[PDB]
Write a structure and sequence with these properties.
five-stranded parallel β-sheet; EC 2.8.1.1; mitochondrion; transferase; Oxidized Rhodanese, domain 1; 3-mercaptopyruvate sulfurtransferase activity; monomer
Length: 293
């Protein structure tokens, strides 16, 4: 359920002109969705110091199922709806998401997919991220944003989500191509999985690896659609066939979904449980690692 695709990328120039124009409001809401591993950057404090004028902080640590044993799992429809409503977002709002990643994108695609998986098509990511917004000198502020509340209705679009059981069945059916966006070393099992206890690295049998950072240019901009298409083809990923994206915790997998969407394939589903869930639930026979093990 959607044939003509709504823009998934907006430029810094466009967003800056919109903010100059007074467009932030019910029709346009801007989110910093940054999140960092423990012991590194301070997402909320960075947002407090420097944000696009009128933007809000989208707290992924809150906007998830807290009761799950697994990482960064979708909240319920109500939890999402209540949270986004509280940021002034309704079903008529154009949501623009950025993050402060050093290359140019990490969490923002996750948030773009969250809106889509909850039925909202009017969502985009800021091409080049906050990194480029800053480099180009666009306005930043520490003034508080206080959007008026709105009502949002969320409706899960199951086709854009996969469960553990569906990935396990797929091991057998081979119906979907399973593409993992984690860095190469962790995908192969030669580098450990971080921020976890006794979680081995490796990958689900039958997977293909497409490290997420390959999607962006060295400046942090999305690669062109011709470039993206060439990447999938060189990976033996056929865009005319079904595709499930997976990673550590369902976050960077959303960069595969974004890349495929800009190549005209909106149908990629995210395995939200991802490797973290897989390792904990699946028989070890279903995964491989170079060490090995």
């Amino acid at each position: 359920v959607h044939q003509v695709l709504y823009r998934a990328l907006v430029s810094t120039k466009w967003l800056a002109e919109s903010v100059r124009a007074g467009k932030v409001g019910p029709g346009l809401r801007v989110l910093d969705a940054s999140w960092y591993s423990p012991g590194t950057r301070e997402a909320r404090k960075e947002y407090l110091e420097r944000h696009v004028p009128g933007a809000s902080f989208f707290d992924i640590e809150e906007c998830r199922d807290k009761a799950s044993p697994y990482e960064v799992m979708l909240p319920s429809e109500a939890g999402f709806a209540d949270y986004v409503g509280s940021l002034g977002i309704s079903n008529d709002t154009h949501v623009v998401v950025y993050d402060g990643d050093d290359l140019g994108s990490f969490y923002a695609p996750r948030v773009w997919w969250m809106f889509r998986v909850f039925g909202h098509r009017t969502v985009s990511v800021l091409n080049g991220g906050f990194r480029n917004w800053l480099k180009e000198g666009h306005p930043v502020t520490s003034e508080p944003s206080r959007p008026e509340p709105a009502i949002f209705k969320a409706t899960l679009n199951r086709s854009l989500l996969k469960t553990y059981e569906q990935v396990l069945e797929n091991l057998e059916s081979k119906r979907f191509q399973l593409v993992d966006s984690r860095a190469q070393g962790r995908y192969l099992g030669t580098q450990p999985e971080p921020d976890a206890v006794g979680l081995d690295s490796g990958h689900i049998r039958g997977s293909v690896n497409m490290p997420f950072m390959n999607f962006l240019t060295e400046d942090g901009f999305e690669k062109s659609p011709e470039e993206l298409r060439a990447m999938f083809e060189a990976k033996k990923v056929d865009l005319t066939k079904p595709l499930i994206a997976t990673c550590r915790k369902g976050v960077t997998a959303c960069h595969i979904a974004l890349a495929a969407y800009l190549c005209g394939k909106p149908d990629v589903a995210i395995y939200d449980g991802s490797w973290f869930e897989w390792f904990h639930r699946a028989p070890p026979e279903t995964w491989v690692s170079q060490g090995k093990g």
